[PDB]
Design a protein around this ligand. Sequence first.
Ligand code: HEA
Ligand code: HEA
Ligand code: CUA
Ligand SMILES: [Cu+2]
Ligand SMILES: [Zn+2]
Lengths: 48, 56, 117, 58, 236, 100, 535, 374, 124, 268
Amino acid sequence: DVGPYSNLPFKVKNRRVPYAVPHFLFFAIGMGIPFFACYVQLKRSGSI
Amino acid sequence: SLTRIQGSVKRRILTDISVGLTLGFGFASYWWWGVHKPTVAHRENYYIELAKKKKA
Amino acid sequence: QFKTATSIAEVEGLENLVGPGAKTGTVPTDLEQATGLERYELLGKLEGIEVFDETPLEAVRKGTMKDPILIDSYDDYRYVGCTGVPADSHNIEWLKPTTEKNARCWECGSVYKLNFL
Amino acid sequence: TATEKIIELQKFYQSTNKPIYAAHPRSKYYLIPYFGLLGVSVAATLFYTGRACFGIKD
Amino acid sequence: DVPTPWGIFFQDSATPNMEGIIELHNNIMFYLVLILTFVSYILYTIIYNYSNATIVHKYMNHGQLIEIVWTTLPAVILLIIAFPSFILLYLCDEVISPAMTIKAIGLQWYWKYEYSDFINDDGEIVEFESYVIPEELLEDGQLRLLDVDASVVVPVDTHIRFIVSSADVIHDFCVPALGVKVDASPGRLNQTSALIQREGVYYGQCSELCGVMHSAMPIKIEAVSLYEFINWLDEQ
Amino acid sequence: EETYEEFSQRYEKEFDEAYDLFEVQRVLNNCFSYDIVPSPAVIGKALNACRRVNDYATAVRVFEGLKHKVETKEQYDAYLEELKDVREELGIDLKEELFP
Amino acid sequence: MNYINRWLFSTNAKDIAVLYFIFALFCGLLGSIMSLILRLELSAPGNQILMGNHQLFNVVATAHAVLMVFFLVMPAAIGFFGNYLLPLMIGASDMSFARLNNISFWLLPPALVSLLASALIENGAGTGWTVYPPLAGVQSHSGPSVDLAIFALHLTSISSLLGAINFITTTLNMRTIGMTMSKLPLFVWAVVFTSILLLLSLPVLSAGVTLLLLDRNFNTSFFEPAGGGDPILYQHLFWFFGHPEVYILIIPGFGIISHIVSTYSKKPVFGAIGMVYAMGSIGFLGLLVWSHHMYTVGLDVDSRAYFTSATMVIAVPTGIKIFSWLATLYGGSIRYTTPMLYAFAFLFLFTVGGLSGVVLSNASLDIAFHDTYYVIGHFHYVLSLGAVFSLFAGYYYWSPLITGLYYNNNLANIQFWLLFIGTNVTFFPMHFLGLNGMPRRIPDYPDAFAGWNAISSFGSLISIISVILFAYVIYDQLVNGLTNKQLSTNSLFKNPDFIESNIIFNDNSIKSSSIDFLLTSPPLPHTFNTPAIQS
Amino acid sequence: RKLILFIVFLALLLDNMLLTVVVPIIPSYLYENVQVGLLFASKATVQLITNPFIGLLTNRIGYPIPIFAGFCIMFVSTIMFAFSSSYAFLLIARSLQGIGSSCSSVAGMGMLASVYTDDEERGNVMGIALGGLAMGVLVGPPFGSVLYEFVGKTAPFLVLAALVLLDGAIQLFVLQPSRVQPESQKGTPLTTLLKDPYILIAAGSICFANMGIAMLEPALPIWRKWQLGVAFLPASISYLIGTNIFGILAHKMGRWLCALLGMIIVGVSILCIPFAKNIYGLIAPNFGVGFAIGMVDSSMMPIMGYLVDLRHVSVYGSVYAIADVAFCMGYAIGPSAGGAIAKAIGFPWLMTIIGIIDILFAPLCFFLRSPPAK
Amino acid sequence: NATVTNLEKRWEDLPETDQKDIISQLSERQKLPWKDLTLSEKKAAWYISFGEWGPRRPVHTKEDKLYIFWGTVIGIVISATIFGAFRYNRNVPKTMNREWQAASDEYLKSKNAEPFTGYSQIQS
Amino acid sequence: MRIQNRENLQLFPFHLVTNSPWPLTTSLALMSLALTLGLTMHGYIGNHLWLFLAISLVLSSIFLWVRDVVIEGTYLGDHTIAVRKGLNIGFMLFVLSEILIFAALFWSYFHSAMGPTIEIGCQWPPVGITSIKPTELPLLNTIILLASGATVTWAHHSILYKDRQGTLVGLFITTLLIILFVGCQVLEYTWATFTIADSVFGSIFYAGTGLHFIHMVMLIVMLAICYARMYFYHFTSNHHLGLETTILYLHVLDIIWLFLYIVFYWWG
Ligand code: HEA
Ligand code: HEA
Ligand code: CUA
Ligand SMILES: [Cu+2]
Ligand SMILES: [Zn+2]
């Protein structure tokens, strides 16, 4: 099954949910994790 | 004659290394005679007048 | 797992390279314990045969289409790197001779053909 | 047989059809406790590292 | 002195050491500008002449005269730079007779100054401590995060030796205009020297990290004349 | 380390032994890759090699490389007054007369 | 079960590089967002986003340094480009110790969890990237925060050491039939030279951090000056790792640039032996100078003199590489593809970054620049504009050969221009702020430093847009990647020569100097069955 | 004062570097027991002849003039290396280098002893001073081989001459040898020093340590191309580490015990040498030998001055000249005698005899635990 | 004539089985002595081998540079719009007012500060 | 490459390792060890039965690696002349790394000893700290280590001359003679009058002479695994890489102990 989409750990075609959701969620979580820590530590010390 | 050309790249290298240094020295003799020396002159003339007032 | 070989003419696979065993009360020798790609080396070096070659490419003659340099391969392709006829003149240029096409080495011009074994 | 079983386990590990760590009829005793206790250790260091983020102590 | 809004260059100097630092920096910038202009011109030439060219020179790859000329020239520049650097490093220091000593202890989030001289027979040594004025209590015209309640006061034209130590963590004494940047470790005494040529006010800030309120630890030095120093010392 | 009169003999010899079009284009590609412009005699051999191999485009692109290798325009116009009988006998037409 | 035996229980070296890439993207997104949080608070004077917490500002900086130095640049530069490319270029099937490759990969995810849990289980670890001893005690940081951040520098150290040993032991006895160790490509030499520095530098860091841990938790008084210890010791034991580390990030980049300069300007590299000896000298002289980081601690007057001399000697070896790249580019033909734009933007910005370093190596001038934004602006050009540019160039160079799918040229050019403008707008005014006297690691600043701080906060919003466009470029590469090889001639890595016909070119298209670009479009799992031959 | 130690370090480093750079190049002139022996002996014999005269002259004139003279002789010797194309001319250049090496070593050691009066400080400074010899011998051969293979012959000598010129500029800017200052009072004659036994055991401890080395390098099977660069590497590192460690540890441990242990290690390593029958087997012993030699230097060199300050007059120069003569006594006699013994009995037998003598002489250093005061 | 005339407007549209027929008809038409070839064949031979089709096309066409330029402009206009929105909602301390930065000027004038280039705290 | 039936066997002498589950499991055990050790020291756990489980799991994972590393050389038979050289180079580059963690601790001993601070009265081993006499038990340790260095050579010169009883006895004596070192140095840690927190002297002495202890438990394990693998006929007279790998670890530790006895016990 050697070919162009054979060495990738994730499936890109012939898929129930379109690949856009998995692609966008990765970057959204990556760019949203550094805000949750700030929220937790701000709410742990009085400030809103 | 006009049908015997032997060296062309070497002269290009020599004319391009002898112009990248003239420009460099031009842009470096403006930092030391147009940005540096007058500042020191102003600094010294300020100090050669702060002492005359104290003397008087 | 089967009949044991005594020279590399009777080695038809990994089934012929088990060998007998040592006797109780002795330090076993390498002819009494060797199984895989290890014993093949032992059986080759006791005769003068080197199983794993380390001989570089031919740098004696150039290559013409009528008379090409023959590279031996067990597949349909083999990567060959050319460095020249005097053997270090040409820089290193890599080529992929194949069973349907020949490499030609854009700078010096050597042609390489593939012999399938 | 004798202490030279080496010419009998070399005909076994070749022609096995199973991974090398689960081929002998002894690997169960090593592999069941290990994979059993690892899933307890990794499930206890994720209960105290989420229970500490909330400020709970013992 | 005080920083200016859209600053580009150093603050004004008031001690010989900062003047030497400025001179050495302006000496090095000469060679740095020359090298940058050379590289920029060569890149321009490559872009203008050799962009999508028909002829490829694939046999000029060795060099022997030119490979010695980018290996020896840079060394000469480094030696020329290293001469004045060593001269300044060994020359400028407190060669003769320090005249006053100020011990500056850096606690957690303020400063503590002692004048080691002016001692009575009973240990009446002059001492005070410096805090930062909060933004709520500033008067009309004071600088935010730089004005303090007590400020170091020194005479003009006098050698001053600062001895710096620490009580909690590693702080760092800084007065940019005066050319003083020394460290404050918990178990060693460091020393620096300063001579002031003109009267005025000199502001400074801490450098090494020490915790939450690392941004509120200003330093303020006034350079009064001798008569005003004598009058001020007879009140504290 | 090679002189003009050794370059202009080695490449004549290499051009008088090419047997295909790949070899002709290879030898022409590494002739225009030195600091020496090829002599008027070497290009005379290159055109005969292109005639044995039966190629027309290569015989016209050869003249267009001289226009870029030469420093000025007078040298180009001096090459074309000595490589003129070779053109009007073989039949090669310059690109500025075809307007391709 | 086939998935688990190919992507969790793995031995193939080219299947671990893809996991390294997918991890590096995540750990480079986190650090960039944590940097944007910093630059949105340093915008105008006062307390803007983080309401009054000066803690949670130091934590952000520490997590931004540790994440983007240890979790992005090292994994990308040693794993995705070293594990994947070295065996193919030297002609070996797989590495010598594959299971250590798997363990080196898999020690990183358990290291990210500790760092992320060291910022939520208490106030945090606001000790700076360099965890200095007298502040990182149990009087200022009292909790399991610094403890859990010291453990994220142990697992990473183990991974780096096991990778270095494998790289050194693979390039010695796993070469092809005719590759002596003087015909090796430049990238392999760079990886070997960095793997030696990793061996000779990591143990000192491990000893220092372990001693700090013992001082915190087992009251041993190594660096407490109330029992006979000195904090300065830690500084030594840290900075012996500090300077070699800084070169480990940059030597792998250099070789990458070399390949690009050799391929899109059709000329072999000027003086390869000179370049290998230059890399060797840079590696060797990176161990004999480490105390230019500490001139203000109170050293002798003859220890400053030695280090001010031993630091300026490194300028000689790097000039050889720069001038060699210029000489390589001089005579040949240049076609401006997207890797070559990055290669060109690395020869100029890195020079600007390294030239400011010669101004800070002097012991005399360092009393005006230490703990100031001059050092910051110095190291961004060499880190942010020197290494990340090389990573992007390597990606745009080797992505088609690895995945088999092409990418849009126009969006790549747009991303490059936006990154260029943003990085040159964000890091340059820091020089002016440093010259005028602004210290490091301060949330709030006096009223005078406002203006430039408003200009450096405008470039970060241009760089984040470049990151988002990079995400979309990856999306457009993965989907409809087969039909993006006819839009532009960027796909071809070498174009026809002047005399070469199109018909002859289409029959003989691939010309290279290494085995890298002759392989199939996605490389085969087992690439070499019969050994490769060299003359 | 530390600049003084730096000057002495530089002098020793440059001297040993110019002494050792040749072995990359000696095969070209030569093309080996007998031919290469003269190259070794020429420098050592000339140095041995010239040490006592410099030791005597230092009292009359002082230190900086001999230091600068050794400098000038070294520069002239480098230039003479540069323009040599015959086997005979090399010997003359070697012999000219010998005087400069002798003068630099004797004057530097004596002046370091004079300026530094305390015992522990004297040992600590002399260890770092002696480290330069090991560092230069480490650095020389690779440097010479690389420039010979790349730039061609006569380049390494020009580079080393440039480095020498830098050293001379430093010496001029630091010491400024402009005036002549005779010492406070004349020292004891060399005959009186020869009468004293403890100084004799101190000299013999250094003398017997170098025999195993001096007999070995002339006979190594190295006289491919890469082998010449790495041939002398291990002993340099061992000597460096040994000197640096034991210059500090000697005072607290006790110098007699350190000397005893070092000589025993020398004997053991020499005895272990002839077992090996391949070139690589020579790697392991050499380290140990080098390390041991360093100990026997760092503990035995300073004590000379101590004896001078405990039973004679505090005038240096002659005693450190005695130490240098003992140091050089092995390289002048070795190649011109050992081969004869090699013809007489054998090579391994000679090595075993030398090792046995080294082990036997070890107990005699116990006598230096405490000497009678004057 | 029609088969070869004006190949500059048809070559990239023909299939790869009608392209290998023209090449195999100009290769048996070039064996004849030149000067017997028509001008159209001379143009076709030059175009088929050395022409701006296939692997000889430029990386950037005229309609791609405008695209890149107007993609960068619209990527710089969005950062400006996002940054301005974060600029109206700020915490402005009491000190950043013109009537407060002119009072510090009198203090810095009385205690002579920056006798060189200048002192001024007015930045609105 | 012209032998008759050559395509039936590999064409290159290198090992293609099969898929294994151990790298992931060791990482999962080290994660648990790290988090539990970081938390248990500050509360949050209480019970000390989790850290022990983590350490036991890590050790068991290493042992399960070495099982598969032994079945691939003795039973399957994939260790050619190239693989053995690679393994030797690997072990050398780990010994080298483990030697450079002792240099740091030696530089932390020479940085305080030379220049003692004002707080401690300027003196090594300071007032109130009676050092360990170097004419006692720390001589038996040196002599036992020197004897052990000689007894394992009689075990490697009896496996090349084909003597079995004479290769088992040597290894037995070596294993029973490195246990006495640990026993002596665990009895000298209970007859001492200074702990790890009484000085900078009692904290660097217990941190360079305590890592050696951990490294010599490893030799006991390695020598047991080499006696048990010789009793069962696993070693040929020319293919034994467990003995060669173990002998280069004993001699290095002896050389290191000869530096921990003249710099820590005599010098003061
Ligand atoms: C990653 C890139 C990188 C590299 C390669 C280096 C290596 C060098 N670094 Fe290092 N440096 C850092 C980034 C880097 N550094 C960082 C981040 C720190 C610590 C910051 C912190 O801890 O907060 C540090 C540490 C550090 C400091 C301490 C800063 C301080 O005092 O606070 C200094 C200056 O003192 C410095 C300067 C230099 C120099 C001169 C080099 C040289 O190797 C650079 C050589 C480059 C050139 C010389 C360009 C050559 C170009 C030519 C055209 C040659 C022409 C010839 C000449 C110019 C004569 N570096
Ligand atoms: C790794 C090097 C690195 C990187 C990437 C960055 C990123 C950025 N850094 Fe720098 N910065 C440092 C070096 C680096 N920094 C260090 C070491 C510190 C800590 C110093 C300390 O401890 O005090 C620091 C901290 C730091 C601060 C806080 C300084 C302080 O108050 O003390 C600031 C601004 O205040 C700043 C500036 C910026 C900005 C605006 C960015 C942003 O512009 C980010 C730029 C955007 C990118 C670089 C995109 C990244 C690309 C990807 C993620 C894709 C990767 C590509 C592939 C995998 C193919 N940095
Ligand atoms: Cu206080 Cu910093
Ligand atoms: Cu540095
Ligand atoms: Zn070729």
